[PDB]
Amino acid sequence: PCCEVITNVNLPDDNVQSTLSQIENAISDVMGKPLGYIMSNYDYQKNLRFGGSNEAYCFVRITSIGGINRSNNSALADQITKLLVSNLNVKSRRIYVEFRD
């Protein structure tokens, strides 16, 4: 699967790499998928806005094949949100996680 983090939070490369790594480990864990199938990215979009505001915000897009489990999907979004909250300085309310296939 694929996890694209689209955010206006400027994070240094090491913090980006470790964050994506923890996220991959959660995907692997929750979804039962070896790390060899997993793509991730942190796409820094300084002009990104939500709610009429350019304050820190993360849009997380998770693409799998996929579209199979709700409790896995719900638990994954929860882990990723928690991971992002913990690494980024972003309010939980300013993270949106979307699933697709």
Side-chain angles (χ1 to χ4, degrees), residues 1-69 71-99 101:
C2 319
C3 178
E4 302 160 55
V5 177
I6 303 170
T7 179
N8 51 20
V9 178
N10 203 16
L11 197 61
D13 291 7
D14 289 7
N15 306 269
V16 178
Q17 288 300 294
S18 55
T19 302
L20 290 175
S21 178
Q22 304 170 251
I23 287 176
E24 301 163 355
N25 298 339
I27 289 158
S28 189
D29 183 355
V30 172
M31 292 192 188
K33 250 124 218 298
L35 219 72
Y37 300 139
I38 300 166
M39 196 189 349
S40 68
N41 190 42
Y42 187 102
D43 188 351
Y44 175 57
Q45 291 295 314
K46 59 174 173 183
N47 280 310
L48 180 63
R49 300 155 56 92
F50 182 71
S53 158
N54 190 36
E55 290 290 284
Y57 178 78
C58 307
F59 176 54
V60 181
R61 197 190 275 122
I62 295 157
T63 299
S64 57
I65 51 121
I68 152 223
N69 220 307
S71 56
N72 290 357
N73 290 336
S74 173
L76 185 57
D78 182 62
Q79 280 311 131
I80 289 157
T81 298
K82 275 209 67 109
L83 253 8
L84 293 178
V85 177
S86 168
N87 288 279
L88 263 73
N89 183 10
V90 66
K91 270 295 288 180
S92 178
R93 70 177 174 86
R94 304 272 295 178
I95 299 169
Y96 175 55
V97 187
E98 175 189 293
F99 289 90
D101 38 37

